Amino acid sequence: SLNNLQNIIYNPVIPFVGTIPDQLDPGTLIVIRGHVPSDADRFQVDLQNGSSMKPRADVAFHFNPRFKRAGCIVCNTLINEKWGREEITYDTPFKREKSFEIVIMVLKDKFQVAVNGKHTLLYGHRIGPEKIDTLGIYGKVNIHSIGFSF
Ligand SMILES: OC[C@H]1O[C@@H](O[C@H]2[C@H](O)[C@@H](O)[C@H](O)O[C@@H]2CO)[C@H](O)[C@@H](O)[C@H]1O
Ligand code: NA
Ligand code: NI
């Protein structure tokens, strides 16, 4: 249910980096609506510990749709500017020139991600979700809205 969803941020310029307005406790939703442009090779939604660039902030949850060949979604965690073990989901619901609604649900033990009303993937927590205070969106993607349900 998307009641309690409050959209902030409309049509942000990409790259977008913004502070998350509350702690990502179990039951929290992050809802991102947009489109993949026709020339898209990849984009990413990063749940970050801070917004530092040098050194690069840790990414607790890197959610990275890629579109070359059959496409996929790579999920991973960045710590001390080093990527961890990749979790690759090959059944991607993203397609160039198609719209999407990403819903990231924060559970106690994992993120549960649904795209356009259909379950997409799970990703177990590698960093405590309380350390997540920043949402980054990078790459070839168009964003209409970003909202949260706490
Ligand atoms: O793990 C996410 C991370 O991947 C990097 O690229 C990987 C690539 O996904 C992997 O299949 C290949 O074998 O090695 C590369 C390691 O650099 C990206 O450069 C980075 O942006 C992240 O998306
Ligand atoms: Na990256
Ligand atoms: Ni549109």
Author numbering: 4 to 153
What does the paper say about this structure?
Galectins are a family of proteins with some specificity for β-galactoside binding at their carbohydrate-recognition domain (CRD). Tandem-repeat-type galectins, like Gal-8, contain two distinct CRDs that are covalently connected via a peptide linker. In the present study, we used different conditions to crystallize the Gal-8 N-terminal CRD with its linker, and five structures could be solved. The N-terminal CRD prefers sulfated and sialylated glycans, whereas the C-terminal CRD prefers blood group A/B. In particular, the N-terminal CRD strongly binds to sulfated and sialylated glycans.
